[PDB]
Amino acid sequence: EMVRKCDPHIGLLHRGTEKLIEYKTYLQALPYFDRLDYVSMMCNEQAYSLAVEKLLNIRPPPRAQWIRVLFGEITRLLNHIMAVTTHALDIGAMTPFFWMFEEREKMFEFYERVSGARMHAAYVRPGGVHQDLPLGLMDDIYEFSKNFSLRIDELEEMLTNNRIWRNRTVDIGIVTAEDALNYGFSGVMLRGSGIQWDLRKTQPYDVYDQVEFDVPIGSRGDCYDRYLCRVEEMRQSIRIISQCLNKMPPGEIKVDDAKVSPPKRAEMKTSMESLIHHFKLYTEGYQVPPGATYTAIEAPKGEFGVYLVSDGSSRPYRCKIKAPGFAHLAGLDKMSKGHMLADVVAIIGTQDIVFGEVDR
Amino acid sequence: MWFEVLPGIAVMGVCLFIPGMATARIHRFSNGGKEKRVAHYPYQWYLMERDRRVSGVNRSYVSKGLENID
Amino acid sequence: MNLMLALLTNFTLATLLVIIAFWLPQLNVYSEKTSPYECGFDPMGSARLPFSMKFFLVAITFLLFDLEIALLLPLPWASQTANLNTMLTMALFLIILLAVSLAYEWTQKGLEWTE
Amino acid sequence: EDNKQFFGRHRWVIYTTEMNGKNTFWDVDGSMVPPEWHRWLHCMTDDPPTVKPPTARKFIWTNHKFNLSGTPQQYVPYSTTRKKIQEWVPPSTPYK
Amino acid sequence: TYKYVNLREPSMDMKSVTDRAAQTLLWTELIRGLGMTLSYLFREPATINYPFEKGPLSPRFRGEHALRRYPSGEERCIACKLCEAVCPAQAITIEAEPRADGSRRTTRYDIDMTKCIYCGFCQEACPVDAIVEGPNFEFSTETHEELLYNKEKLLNNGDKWEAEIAANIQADYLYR
Amino acid sequence: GEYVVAKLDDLINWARRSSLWPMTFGLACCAVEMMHMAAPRYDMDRFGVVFRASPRQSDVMIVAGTLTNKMAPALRKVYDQMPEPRYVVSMGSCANGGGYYHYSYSVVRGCDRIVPVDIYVPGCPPTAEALLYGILQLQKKIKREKRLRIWYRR
Amino acid sequence: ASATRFIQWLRNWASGRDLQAKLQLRYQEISKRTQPPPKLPVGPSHKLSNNYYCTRDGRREAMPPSIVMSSQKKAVSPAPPIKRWELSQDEPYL
Amino acid sequence: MFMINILMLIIPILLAVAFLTLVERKVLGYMQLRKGPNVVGPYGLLQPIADAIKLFIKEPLRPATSSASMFILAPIMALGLALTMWIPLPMPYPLINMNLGVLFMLAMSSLAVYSILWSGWASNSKYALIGALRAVAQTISYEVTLAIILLSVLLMSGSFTLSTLITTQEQMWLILPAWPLAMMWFISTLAETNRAPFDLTEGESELVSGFNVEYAAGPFALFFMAEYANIIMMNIFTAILFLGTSHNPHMPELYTINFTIKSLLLTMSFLWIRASYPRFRYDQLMHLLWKNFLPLTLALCMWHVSLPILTSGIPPQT
Ligand SMILES: CCCCCCCCCCCCCCCCCC(=O)OC[C@H](COP(=O)([O-])OCC[N+](C)(C)C)OC(=O)CCCCCCCCCCCCCCCCC
Ligand SMILES: CCCCCCCCCCCCCCCCCC(=O)OC[C@H](COP(=O)(O)OCCN)OC(=O)CCCCCCCCCCCCCCCCC
Ligand SMILES: CCCCCCCCCCCCO[C@@H]1O[C@H](CO)[C@@H](O[C@H]2O[C@H](CO)[C@@H](O)[C@H](O)[C@H]2O)[C@H](O)[C@H]1O
Ligand SMILES: CCCCCCCCCCCCO[C@@H]1O[C@H](CO)[C@@H](O[C@H]2O[C@H](CO)[C@@H](O)[C@H](O)[C@H]2O)[C@H](O)[C@H]1O
Ligand code: SF4
Ligand code: SF4
Ligand code: SF4
């Protein structure tokens, strides 16, 4: 049962997403980003929106930026619940999956209430967000967040001090700090080994410079430390969410520039300019000045970026998608040296892999 | 609620009760209303065989008392 | 007799269940259905190829430890001896030598699986 | 309804035993809920149609139909456009 | 700022050492874990009683499509084809011509529901609120062909669900 | 004659639909909503629906996600390795007809080019409740089987 | 919420917490499913004067890249070295 | 009247096993904040029947590469030996009263291991083989410790007769003088029954289904029935070994009631443990037994040899 070589064969979920995007307008291509890391939908939307906003040279309004950070951290909670509980489920601890997927179910209701969809919201767009938060949503998000830390505590009461859990994770898949960098790792795959790096702190986007939170840091670079980093990241997400709820500003939700963001329906049905711009934005779409940007965010799984090429038209010329799981999986053979079959099962979980983003 | 698990436990409990009850009752029925004789050692078997001869009906569980002493 | 009757009934019931299981259901047999399973892709080599044992040294030591129980299982009867002075010395002697053998293999890394 | 129950179990429907000719004593499905009650049952609103009825229109179905898949009433797709090219129809008399 | 998740050196006083020996030998932290699942055993489960109980939805929910009408009964769709242009999945197919009264109306309106991504872009693009995604999510079928909707199917959906569709649009149009 | 086989269908049908074991088989996004159907709110297990990893011990295949050309031979393989009777539920637009990758060079335009499909669950993804509606629709399909009635009249 | 006092006590003792204060099932503390209508604000460009689009056109202020070198003194780094992170005062050791 | 007695033993066992599967699914459901079966019959009471009927009308498969005779033989041994483990159990009267009932169960339990080895081997598939060799590893881990743990307990009972354990515990449960052994015995029974956290020969998340991955329909059911019959039997044995129920010869049913409750609760704890812990790595199971339980079991064996002698508490041979 000792593993002598891991050869990950991927492409079983390769769906030519990047080639398909070239045949779409910039708006039409936005839903493709929900279906990459399909556990972190709204964060993928944010990364693509920032790239298009950067190429357009426009700025989303302050309220949209706060809604983006709010739902980005709600999205981070959804990811880490899926990451930790399915990681535990593979290692044999099935119960936490059930307790914490009832929380995931309530966070899907927030997605559905703002966008009408539980998962592929298509809510974050270049220029802001699609719609404003419905009245009374922020109260319900506060009610959920009031109780969530207790759920994390029950999760830790089952795993953190458990000797069986620690035996299955401690000193498993150790990765040195230098190897992680040269292998292209990011996110918790760096911080687990002690590398102090978090794109929300070092290369902040939206309103991340206006919230306080701590970056968890590991000391042994193994599965257990990455597990503890992810759990502590969930606690810091709640800490950020509390700030977004309290500091939400008033105002519009998409850039007040109708050559990029569509007008309100009432305006479109009254004003000639609004109708023309609505008509043109939903047929041709907005043209983007020629250029190329690599734009990245601290997605829940790691650094998620797009290299986006514009030829001046309303359709992207090239859209290369950078998925953090691509480089993490490429290091699976390196991380599994000297381990057994059951350890590789754990090392796959500790990398937190979704093959929608890996294969695209 | 959690007490909706009780019906399946009771049915499981009743099934596990039957083997012990049946064996106790079948032993008494086939041993003249008494416990089945236990013969772990040659001595006990020897006495049991002697009772079968003494019974006069070839049954070690048919007992003979003072009325068989003239 | 009773024991032989009981064993025959147990394995007779099990065989009857297998017989019923094989002749009651409607069958549709073809090559792909009966091909060896391996997660959707064809097996790469024979499952009869050698499968290395990493705990081979523990497995042999089990044979030697698994005979200590035969020597120790008579202890409840031996406790009824008149010569308890000799008993207890010899019973403790065997268990200690078994403990020493375990310590030796432990300290010499015999219980570590080979990589 | 029972507002002491936790959110999600505080509303429920006991389906009829017969609907549109079908015996539904054992066979029930969510598609039997008519749209006016569908809104209230799924908590898209707080007011039942008894208190806040829907707006009446002469084209709205007066009879709700459940899922008709797998029955002789199932929808069958077809093209709704007329013939595009018209063929030449030869004469009915012989001249040749 | 940053914090350490696992960088604590345990104390080496005989009481602390004896506490950990008890933990190793008496399984106290594994017993403690048993307490948690015992507590859950006596909690009310979160399961709803579907299909008699339904999960909560919002007026924005994106479900089955339907073509709507004006109160007079006239169709709202004017064959502008904005929905067909924006559809990320190319799930919409339209043909139009002047109606017998000169009105601009469609003669084909297909949605391939196995192409559609239920994204709602079509109802954003529509300038007359003709095509919408209604609240119905329980329309699974036994054949693929049943999911290829033509205009007759979608108009029937509009008439079927209009009572609910109108009330949901009334509750959310001020956010649009 | 007719009465006995009529009851016998009711019994074998009741057992088969009350004990439906899907293969532990998910492909992409839609497998996440399949998880949410196993989660406490919907609890598929309460209907008698239990995931089992081995194809040999599975009755239903839920095709939950996009089927690529690279994956297609593997999906057909594990389907063939289910014992009969077996059922296929096609979940989501990708499985139903290729969906949003319908025009891709690497995607199978509907899993029904590879396997027979009993039920098509629409959506991208279908909600967990919509999938539960599809599973219960599959149960009612099984309730209508007439295997012995047809056998009797052969 | 309907659990008896004995059962409330039992699952509190077993878990070691006060589970009742933070129930995971939602009751009537959630928002009502029928809300009053909103009246959403408008953006900065909703003015009747001093609002010419050519003064607020971001796309038209985008310019092609600056050619630094084309093949057609102190050493520098790409940016100043990153400052070393400071430990949290909220909770430095988990 | 003996054939009737045999049927009064094995038919209830198969019914108890059937409803143990329901109780497991419900107990894990509520510990997982859900409900478990409650549709098929009231409170899911008809679920085990539906599952039983469904499997036995499902198509069995003979894998192309498999060894036919051993493939079919293996499930028959599994169920046959699982039922044989019950014939010596005093409840309070055994079906078969053996002098050496304790050693008979040790021998049968060793033989039941081969129903795993041969099913995994005969399958001629890699996941089946990997599961089978985990069974070899698991037996090596617990067998030596299990026998010596029993020997220490029997040094207070003085006999290998299972019924003598009832007499030994007439004034007090043996768990008082031997809770360190009861702890290691309870773990050993989890390993012996391939139960979580030691469910390694099947190990769903690693081996798909392990040793019986190629089994379907009825032949699969026999393995599943054998597993759950072994769960109950080993908890009855634990109850008899450490929680002796007083026996009144004139009211033997009262023994059977108290005795059954203890066995149910011990079986419930197996389900409780399954819901609580992750799975061991199978080389960590070997080290747990050999490096922890074995040194302590060897020491307690010497202690329990000496203790009756030094306290003058040696039991009788009868
Ligand atoms: C814990 C133990 C639990 C055991 C549970 C056992 C099940 C109890 C419930 C039994 C109800 C009857 C089950 C019938 C299912 C038959 C499978 C089926 O559906 O096939 C459809 C077939 C119909 O096939 P068909 O003729 O229509 O067409 C088949 C060809 N193709 C595939 C092309 C269509 O049913 C039959 O052929 C006959 C039905 C028999 C029903 C009565 C059972 C008698 C079977 C005796 C078989 C002879 C060997 C003896 C076996 C030992 C029997 C005890
Ligand atoms: C007068 C003189 C007296 C002389 C005699 C005195 C003796 C008294 C002191 C004896 C010691 C008492 C403890 C004996 C039990 C065995 C203890 C033990 O073995 O624990 C260690 C073992 C390994 O733990 P670990 O930390 O990983 O390994 C050491 C690190 N190198 O830990 C484990 O075993 C891990 C087990 C994991 C699986 C647990 C799953 C079940 C847990 C719940 C069960 C609770 C107990 C149930 C008991 C039932 C009894 C019927
Ligand atoms: C590497 C080799 C290791 C070898 C280790 C061997 C360890 C053996 C230790 C001695 C064990 C027996 O120790 C001895 O037991 C007997 C009891 O049976 C005691 O004897 C005592 O009880 C017996 C009967 O029980 C009386 O007849 C006697 O009058 C009394 O002295 C001895 O006082 C004690 O010294
Ligand atoms: C009379 C019966 C009771 C007496 C006990 C009999 C068994 C004694 C077992 C051997 C004890 C000493 O021998 C043993 O040798 C190894 C060397 O590899 C030591 O050291 C090793 O053990 C542990 C666990 O394997 C490792 O974490 C450690 O890294 C390693 O150095 C052990 O700490 C020591 O326990
Ligand atoms: S919801 Fe989206 S994919 Fe579906 S028809 Fe409308 S625009 Fe096209
Ligand atoms: S449905 Fe609306 S957007 Fe589509 S063609 Fe008709 S009017 Fe235009
Ligand atoms: S149907 Fe939708 S949710 Fe499902 S896999 Fe395809 S894109 Fe993802």
From Swiss-Prot, chain A:
Major location (coarse): mitochondrion
Cofactor binding, note field = Binds 1 [4Fe-4S] cluster.
User: Into which family does the record put it?
Assistant: Belongs to the complex I 49 kDa subunit family.
Query: Where is the protein situated, by its record's location annotation?
Result: Mitochondrion inner membrane
UniProt catalytic activity: a ubiquinone + NADH + 5 H(+)(in) = a ubiquinol + NAD(+) + 4 H(+)(out)
Keyword Oxidoreductase listed? yes
Q: Name one GO biological process term.
A: mitochondrial respiratory chain complex I assembly
Establish whether keyword Mitochondrion is in the entry: yes
Q: How does it assemble?
A: Core subunit of respiratory chain NADH dehydrogenase (Complex I) which is composed of 45 different subunits. Component of the iron-sulfur (IP) fragment of the enzyme. Interacts with NDUFAF3. Interacts with NDUFAF7. Interacts with CERS2.
Q: Which cofactor does it need?
A: [4Fe-4S] cluster
| Domain of life the protein comes from | Eukaryota
Kindly state which keywords UniProt assigns to this record, in alphabetical order: 4Fe-4S, Acetylation, Electron transport, Iron, Iron-sulfur, Membrane, Metal-binding, Methylation, Mitochondrion, Mitochondrion inner membrane, NAD, Oxidoreductase, Respiratory chain, Transit peptide, Translocase, Transport, Ubiquinone
Source lineage: Eukaryota, Metazoa, Chordata, Craniata, Vertebrata
Mod. after translation: Dimethylation at Arg-15 by NDUFAF7 takes place after NDUFS2 assembles into the complex I, leading to stabilize the early intermediate complex.
Signal peptide feature range: none
Under which name does UniProt file this protein?
Answer: NADH dehydrogenase [ubiquinone] iron-sulfur protein 2, mitochondrial
Where Symmetric dimethylarginine occurs, the residues are: R15
Which cysteines share a disulfide bond? none
GO cellular component terms listed in the entry, alphabetical order: mitochondrial inner membrane; mitochondrion; respiratory chain complex I
Curated annotation (Swiss-Prot), chain D:
Membrane association type: Peripheral membrane protein
Is Electron transport found in the keyword set? yes
Q: Any idea where this protein resides?
A: Mitochondrion inner membrane
Q: Which GO terms describe its cellular component?
A: mitochondrial inner membrane; mitochondrion; respiratory chain complex I
Does this UniProt record's set of keywords contain Membrane? Answer: yes
Q: Give the signal peptide range.
A: none
Ordered alphabetically, the record's keywords are: Acetylation, Electron transport, Membrane, Mitochondrion, Mitochondrion inner membrane, Respiratory chain, Transport
Entry superkingdom: Eukaryota
Job description of the protein = Accessory subunit of the mitochondrial membrane respiratory chain NADH dehydrogenase (Complex I), that is believed not to be involved in catalysis. Complex I functions in the transfer of electrons from NADH to the respiratory chain. The immediate electron acceptor for the enzyme is believed to be ubiquinone.
Q: How does it assemble?
A: Complex I is composed of 45 different subunits.
The text of the family note is: Belongs to the complex I NDUFA12 subunit family.
* Protein name per its UniProtKB record: NADH dehydrogenase [ubiquinone] 1 alpha subcomplex subunit 12
Which organism was this protein described from?
Answer: Bos taurus (Bovine)
Top-level taxonomy: Eukaryota, Metazoa, Chordata, Craniata, Vertebrata
Q: Which residues of the full protein are shown?
A: 50 to 145 of 145
UniProtKB/Swiss-Prot annotation, chain F:
- Which reaction(s) are listed as its catalytic activity? a ubiquinone + NADH + 5 H(+)(in) = a ubiquinol + NAD(+) + 4 H(+)(out)
Broad class of where this protein is predominantly found: mitochondrion
Q: Which residues form a coiled coil?
A: none
Per UniProt, the cofactor note for this protein states: Binds 1 [4Fe-4S] cluster.
Membrane topology reported for the UniProt record: Peripheral membrane protein
Cellular component terms (Gene Ontology): mitochondrial inner membrane; respiratory chain complex I
Per the record's keyword annotation, is Mitochondrion included, yes or no?
A: yes
Modified positions (Hydroxyarginine) are R52
Cofactors needed by this protein, per the record, are:
[4Fe-4S] cluster
Q: Where does [4Fe-4S] cluster bind?
A: C29, C30, C94, C124
Compartment list: Mitochondrion inner membrane
Modifications made to the protein after synthesis: Hydroxylated ar Arg-52 by NDUFAF5 early in the pathway of assembly of complex I, before the formation of the juncture between peripheral and membrane arms.
Q: What is one process in the GO biological process aspect for this record?
A: mitochondrial electron transport, NADH to ubiquinone
EC numbers on record: 7.1.1.2
Q: What class of enzyme is it?
A: translocase
Outline what the protein does. Core subunit of the mitochondrial membrane respiratory chain NADH dehydrogenase (Complex I) which catalyzes electron transfer from NADH through the respiratory chain, using ubiquinone as an electron acceptor. Essential for the catalytic activity of complex I.
Known partners and oligomeric status: Core subunit of respiratory chain NADH dehydrogenase (Complex I) which is composed of 45 different subunits. This is a component of the iron-sulfur (IP) fragment of the enzyme.
Family stated for the protein in its record: Belongs to the complex I 20 kDa subunit family.
Please identify the protein, giving its name as recorded.
Answer: NADH dehydrogenase [ubiquinone] iron-sulfur protein 7, mitochondrial
From Swiss-Prot, chain H:
Under the GO molecular function aspect, what terms does this record hold? NADH dehydrogenase (ubiquinone) activity
Query: Which processes are annotated in GO (biological process)?
Result: aerobic respiration; mitochondrial respiratory chain complex I assembly
Query: Ribonucleoprotein: is it a keyword of this entry?
Result: no
The entry's family comment says: Belongs to the complex I subunit 1 family.
How would you summarize the oligomeric state and partners of this protein? Core subunit of respiratory chain NADH dehydrogenase (Complex I) which is composed of 45 different subunits.
> Which residues in this protein are found as N-formylmethionine?
M1
Q: Where in the cell is it found?
A: Mitochondrion inner membrane
Relate the protein's function as given in its record.
Core subunit of the mitochondrial membrane respiratory chain NADH dehydrogenase (Complex I) which catalyzes electron transfer from NADH through the respiratory chain, using ubiquinone as an electron acceptor. Essential for the catalytic activity of complex I. Essential for the assembly of complex I.
Q: Which keywords accompany this UniProt record?
A: Electron transport, Formylation, Membrane, Mitochondrion, Mitochondrion inner membrane, NAD, Respiratory chain, Translocase, Transmembrane, Transmembrane helix, Transport, Ubiquinone
Protein name, per record: NADH-ubiquinone oxidoreductase chain 1
Enumerate the transmembrane spans.
Answer: 2-22, 70-90, 100-120, 146-166, 172-192, 222-242, 253-273, 294-314
Q: How does it sit in the membrane?
A: Multi-pass membrane protein
Q: Which InterPro entries match?
A: NADH_UbQ_OxRdtase_su1/FPO, NADH_UbQ_OxRdtase_su1_CS
* UniProt-listed Enzyme Commission number(s): 7.1.1.2
Record's Gene Ontology CC terms? Answer: mitochondrial inner membrane; respiratory chain complex I
Q: Provide the reaction this enzyme catalyses.
A: a ubiquinone + NADH + 5 H(+)(in) = a ubiquinol + NAD(+) + 4 H(+)(out)
Q: Which Pfam families match?
A: NADHdh
Family annotation (PANTHER family): NADH DEHYDROGENASE SUBUNIT 1 (PTHR11432), NADH-UBIQUINONE OXIDOREDUCTASE CHAIN 1 (PTHR11432:SF3)
Query: EC class of this enzyme?
Result: translocase
Organism expressing this protein natively = Bos taurus
Q: Which cysteines are disulphide-bonded?
A: none
